[PDB]
PDB file of all heavy atoms in Angstrom:
ATOM      1  N   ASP A   3      30.563 163.243-127.274  1.00 44.66           N
ATOM      2  CA  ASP A   3      29.868 162.174-128.026  1.00 44.66           C
ATOM      3  C   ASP A   3      30.696 160.898-127.929  1.00 44.66           C
ATOM      4  O   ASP A   3      31.904 160.910-128.201  1.00 44.66           O
ATOM      5  CB  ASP A   3      29.720 162.672-129.489  1.00 44.66           C
ATOM      6  CG  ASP A   3      30.946 162.605-130.375  1.00 44.66           C
ATOM      7  OD1 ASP A   3      31.788 163.500-130.110  1.00 44.66           O
ATOM      8  OD2 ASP A   3      31.112 161.696-131.143  1.00 44.66           O
ATOM      9  N   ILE A   4      30.051 159.793-127.550  1.00 43.54           N
ATOM     10  CA  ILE A   4      30.716 158.452-127.419  1.00 43.54           C
ATOM     11  C   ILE A   4      30.254 157.612-128.606  1.00 43.54           C
ATOM     12  O   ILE A   4      29.070 157.316-128.662  1.00 43.54           O
ATOM     13  CB  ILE A   4      30.327 157.800-126.044  1.00 43.54           C
ATOM     14  CG1 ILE A   4      28.818 157.732-125.709  1.00 43.54           C
ATOM     15  CG2 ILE A   4      31.065 158.557-124.964  1.00 43.54           C
ATOM     16  CD1 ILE A   4      28.462 156.828-124.559  1.00 43.54           C
ATOM     17  N   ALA A   5      31.165 157.233-129.541  1.00 45.08           N
ATOM     18  CA  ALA A   5      30.858 156.623-130.806  1.00 45.08           C
ATOM     19  C   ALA A   5      31.239 155.198-130.688  1.00 45.08           C
ATOM     20  O   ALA A   5      32.418 154.950-130.492  1.00 45.08           O
ATOM     21  CB  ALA A   5      31.541 157.342-131.947  1.00 45.08           C
ATOM     22  N   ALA A   6      30.269 154.226-130.774  1.00 45.83           N
ATOM     23  CA  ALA A   6      30.418 152.854-130.278  1.00 45.83           C
ATOM     24  C   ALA A   6      31.613 152.232-130.970  1.00 45.83           C
ATOM     25  O   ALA A   6      31.953 152.581-132.151  1.00 45.83           O
ATOM     26  CB  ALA A   6      29.198 152.102-130.491  1.00 45.83           C
ATOM     27  N   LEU A   7      32.237 151.284-130.269  1.00 41.56           N
ATOM     28  CA  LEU A   7      33.428 150.593-130.798  1.00 41.56           C
ATOM     29  C   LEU A   7      32.932 149.498-131.724  1.00 41.56           C
ATOM     30  O   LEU A   7      31.856 148.920-131.481  1.00 41.56           O
ATOM     31  CB  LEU A   7      34.215 150.000-129.602  1.00 41.56           C
ATOM     32  CG  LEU A   7      34.480 150.941-128.410  1.00 41.56           C
ATOM     33  CD1 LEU A   7      34.846 150.134-127.173  1.00 41.56           C
ATOM     34  CD2 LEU A   7      35.478 152.000-128.820  1.00 41.56           C
ATOM     35  N   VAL A   8      33.633 149.349-132.828  1.00 44.41           N
ATOM     36  CA  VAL A   8      33.443 148.304-133.757  1.00 44.41           C
ATOM     37  C   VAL A   8      34.590 147.326-133.714  1.00 44.41           C
ATOM     38  O   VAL A   8      35.552 147.586-134.369  1.00 44.41           O
ATOM     39  CB  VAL A   8      33.346 148.887-135.128  1.00 44.41           C
ATOM     40  CG1 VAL A   8      33.105 147.808-136.202  1.00 44.41           C
ATOM     41  CG2 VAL A   8      32.306 150.015-135.217  1.00 44.41           C
ATOM     42  N   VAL A   9      34.455 146.215-132.941  1.00 44.76           N
ATOM     43  CA  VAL A   9      35.503 145.090-132.832  1.00 44.76           C
ATOM     44  C   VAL A   9      35.256 144.007-133.943  1.00 44.76           C
ATOM     45  O   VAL A   9      34.224 143.380-133.815  1.00 44.76           O
ATOM     46  CB  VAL A   9      35.467 144.441-131.456  1.00 44.76           C
ATOM     47  CG1 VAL A   9      36.613 143.519-131.330  1.00 44.76           C
ATOM     48  CG2 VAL A   9      35.485 145.431-130.303  1.00 44.76           C
ATOM     49  N   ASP A  10      36.090 143.776-134.931  1.00 44.99           N
ATOM     50  CA  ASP A  10      35.890 142.719-136.006  1.00 44.99           C
ATOM     51  C   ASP A  10      36.732 141.578-135.599  1.00 44.99           C
ATOM     52  O   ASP A  10      37.592 141.172-136.419  1.00 44.99           O
ATOM     53  CB  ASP A  10      36.077 143.278-137.428  1.00 44.99           C
ATOM     54  CG  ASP A  10      35.961 142.169-138.550  1.00 44.99           C
ATOM     55  OD1 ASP A  10      35.176 141.192-138.332  1.00 44.99           O
ATOM     56  OD2 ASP A  10      36.681 142.328-139.545  1.00 44.99           O
ATOM     57  N   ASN A  11      36.478 141.004-134.398  1.00 43.11           N
ATOM     58  CA  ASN A  11      37.297 139.889-133.904  1.00 43.11           C
ATOM     59  C   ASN A  11      37.208 138.666-134.825  1.00 43.11           C
ATOM     60  O   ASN A  11      36.200 138.021-134.760  1.00 43.11           O
ATOM     61  CB  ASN A  11      37.015 139.417-132.497  1.00 43.11           C
ATOM     62  CG  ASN A  11      38.184 138.764-131.879  1.00 43.11           C
ATOM     63  OD1 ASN A  11      39.349 139.248-132.103  1.00 43.11           O
ATOM     64  ND2 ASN A  11      37.924 137.741-131.051  1.00 43.11           N
ATOM     65  N   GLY A  12      38.244 138.419-135.568  1.00 47.82           N
ATOM     66  CA  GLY A  12      38.471 137.265-136.492  1.00 47.82           C
ATOM     67  C   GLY A  12      39.503 136.286-135.869  1.00 47.82           C
ATOM     68  O   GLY A  12      39.970 136.529-134.766  1.00 47.82           O
ATOM     69  N   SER A  13      39.733 135.187-136.594  1.00 48.65           N
ATOM     70  CA  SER A  13      40.617 134.028-136.205  1.00 48.65           C
ATOM     71  C   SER A  13      42.104 134.427-136.315  1.00 48.65           C
ATOM     72  O   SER A  13      42.913 134.005-135.479  1.00 48.65           O
ATOM     73  CB  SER A  13      40.283 132.851-137.052  1.00 48.65           C
ATOM     74  OG  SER A  13      40.092 133.264-138.404  1.00 48.65           O
ATOM     75  N   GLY A  14      42.460 135.224-137.345  1.00 48.87           N
ATOM     76  CA  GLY A  14      43.858 135.612-137.679  1.00 48.87           C
ATOM     77  C   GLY A  14      44.198 136.972-137.036  1.00 48.87           C
ATOM     78  O   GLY A  14      45.306 137.077-136.554  1.00 48.87           O
ATOM     79  N   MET A  15      43.376 138.014-137.166  1.00 46.23           N
ATOM     80  CA  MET A  15      43.718 139.345-136.635  1.00 46.23           C
ATOM     81  C   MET A  15      42.688 139.826-135.654  1.00 46.23           C
ATOM     82  O   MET A  15      41.784 139.009-135.351  1.00 46.23           O
ATOM     83  CB  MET A  15      43.805 140.362-137.798  1.00 46.23           C
ATOM     84  CG  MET A  15      44.640 139.875-138.970  1.00 46.23           C
ATOM     85  SD  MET A  15      46.436 139.919-138.745  1.00 46.23           S
ATOM     86  CE  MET A  15      46.723 141.623-138.205  1.00 46.23           C
ATOM     87  N   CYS A  16      42.768 141.067-135.176  1.00 47.05           N
ATOM     88  CA  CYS A  16      41.785 141.622-134.283  1.00 47.05           C
ATOM     89  C   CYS A  16      41.511 143.172-134.521  1.00 47.05           C
ATOM     90  O   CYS A  16      41.725 143.995-133.602  1.00 47.05           O
ATOM     91  CB  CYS A  16      42.110 141.495-132.793  1.00 47.05           C
ATOM     92  SG  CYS A  16      40.886 142.252-131.747  1.00 47.05           S
ATOM     93  N   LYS A  17      40.951 143.495-135.708  1.00 45.79           N
ATOM     94  CA  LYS A  17      40.677 144.886-136.173  1.00 45.79           C
ATOM     95  C   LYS A  17      39.787 145.575-135.153  1.00 45.79           C
ATOM     96  O   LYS A  17      39.052 144.904-134.416  1.00 45.79           O
ATOM     97  CB  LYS A  17      40.175 144.815-137.618  1.00 45.79           C
ATOM     98  CG  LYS A  17      41.257 144.281-138.573  1.00 45.79           C
ATOM     99  CD  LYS A  17      40.982 143.967-140.055  1.00 45.79           C
ATOM    100  CE  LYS A  17      40.031 142.818-140.351  1.00 45.79           C
ATOM    101  NZ  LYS A  17      40.373 141.543-139.768  1.00 45.79           N
ATOM    102  N   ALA A  18      39.995 146.878-134.996  1.00 43.05           N
ATOM    103  CA  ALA A  18      39.116 147.700-134.120  1.00 43.05           C
ATOM    104  C   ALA A  18      39.423 149.197-134.311  1.00 43.05           C
ATOM    105  O   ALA A  18      40.362 149.563-135.024  1.00 43.05           O
ATOM    106  CB  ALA A  18      39.288 147.249-132.672  1.00 43.05           C
ATOM    107  N   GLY A  19      38.604 150.045-133.707  1.00 43.11           N
ATOM    108  CA  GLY A  19      38.538 151.496-133.974  1.00 43.11           C
ATOM    109  C   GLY A  19      37.255 152.117-133.405  1.00 43.11           C
ATOM    110  O   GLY A  19      36.457 151.381-132.725  1.00 43.11           O
ATOM    111  N   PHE A  20      37.129 153.431-133.583  1.00 42.46           N
ATOM    112  CA  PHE A  20      35.911 154.204-133.356  1.00 42.46           C
ATOM    113  C   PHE A  20      34.975 154.055-134.580  1.00 42.46           C
ATOM    114  O   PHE A  20      35.469 153.617-135.634  1.00 42.46           O
ATOM    115  CB  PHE A  20      36.241 155.617-133.021  1.00 42.46           C
ATOM    116  CG  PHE A  20      36.540 155.896-131.588  1.00 42.46           C
ATOM    117  CD1 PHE A  20      36.938 157.166-131.248  1.00 42.46           C
ATOM    118  CD2 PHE A  20      36.410 154.942-130.604  1.00 42.46           C
ATOM    119  CE1 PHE A  20      37.302 157.456-129.893  1.00 42.46           C
ATOM    120  CE2 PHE A  20      36.709 155.211-129.319  1.00 42.46           C
ATOM    121  CZ  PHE A  20      37.152 156.473-128.969  1.00 42.46           C
ATOM    122  N   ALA A  21      33.733 154.466-134.475  1.00 40.10           N
ATOM    123  CA  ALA A  21      32.585 154.208-135.356  1.00 40.10           C
ATOM    124  C   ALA A  21      32.521 155.254-136.516  1.00 40.10           C
ATOM    125  O   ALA A  21      31.635 155.103-137.410  1.00 40.10           O
ATOM    126  CB  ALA A  21      31.297 154.151-134.618  1.00 40.10           C
ATOM    127  N   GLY A  22      33.408 156.284-136.499  1.00 40.69           N
ATOM    128  CA  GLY A  22      33.263 157.541-137.258  1.00 40.69           C
ATOM    129  C   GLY A  22      34.057 157.520-138.524  1.00 40.69           C
ATOM    130  O   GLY A  22      33.923 158.552-139.292  1.00 40.69           O
ATOM    131  N   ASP A  23      34.729 156.440-138.871  1.00 43.06           N
ATOM    132  CA  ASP A  23      35.732 156.454-139.980  1.00 43.06           C
ATOM    133  C   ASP A  23      35.573 155.197-140.799  1.00 43.06           C
ATOM    134  O   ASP A  23      34.873 154.233-140.371  1.00 43.06           O
ATOM    135  CB  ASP A  23      37.160 156.545-139.408  1.00 43.06           C
ATOM    136  CG  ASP A  23      38.262 156.664-140.446  1.00 43.06           C
ATOM    137  OD1 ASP A  23      38.005 157.213-141.552  1.00 43.06           O
ATOM    138  OD2 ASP A  23      39.367 156.153-140.189  1.00 43.06           O
ATOM    139  N   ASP A  24      36.165 155.165-141.982  1.00 39.28           N
ATOM    140  CA  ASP A  24      36.252 154.088-142.937  1.00 39.28           C
ATOM    141  C   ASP A  24      37.595 153.364-142.845  1.00 39.28           C
ATOM    142  O   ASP A  24      38.116 152.895-143.862  1.00 39.28           O
ATOM    143  CB  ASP A  24      35.863 154.579-144.328  1.00 39.28           C
ATOM    144  CG  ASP A  24      36.637 155.864-144.751  1.00 39.28           C
ATOM    145  OD1 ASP A  24      36.458 156.914-144.010  1.00 39.28           O
ATOM    146  OD2 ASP A  24      37.372 155.840-145.690  1.00 39.28           O
ATOM    147  N   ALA A  25      38.186 153.283-141.637  1.00 39.64           N
ATOM    148  CA  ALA A  25      39.501 152.669-141.411  1.00 39.64           C
ATOM    149  C   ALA A  25      39.678 152.369-139.918  1.00 39.64           C
ATOM    150  O   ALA A  25      39.445 153.211-139.116  1.00 39.64           O
ATOM    151  CB  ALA A  25      40.613 153.550-141.902  1.00 39.64           C
ATOM    152  N   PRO A  26      39.977 151.101-139.507  1.00 36.53           N
ATOM    153  CA  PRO A  26      40.229 150.801-138.083  1.00 36.53           C
ATOM    154  C   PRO A  26      41.479 151.570-137.636  1.00 36.53           C
ATOM    155  O   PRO A  26      42.234 152.167-138.406  1.00 36.53           O
ATOM    156  CB  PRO A  26      40.400 149.276-138.061  1.00 36.53           C
ATOM    157  CG  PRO A  26      40.719 148.813-139.443  1.00 36.53           C
ATOM    158  CD  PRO A  26      40.170 149.927-140.360  1.00 36.53           C
TER     159      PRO A  26
END
């Protein structure tokens, strides 16, 4: 199973992770 990437690219940081959790 390939669980799409969630990139929250902001101005100060670059949060990212898999789609399956409540934490990057």
Side-chain angles (χ1 to χ4, degrees):
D3 74 286
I4 53 166
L7 312 161
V8 181
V9 188
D10 176 28
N11 203 38
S13 44
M15 313 282 309
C16 179
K17 293 174 294 305
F20 276 175
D23 184 32
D24 47 300

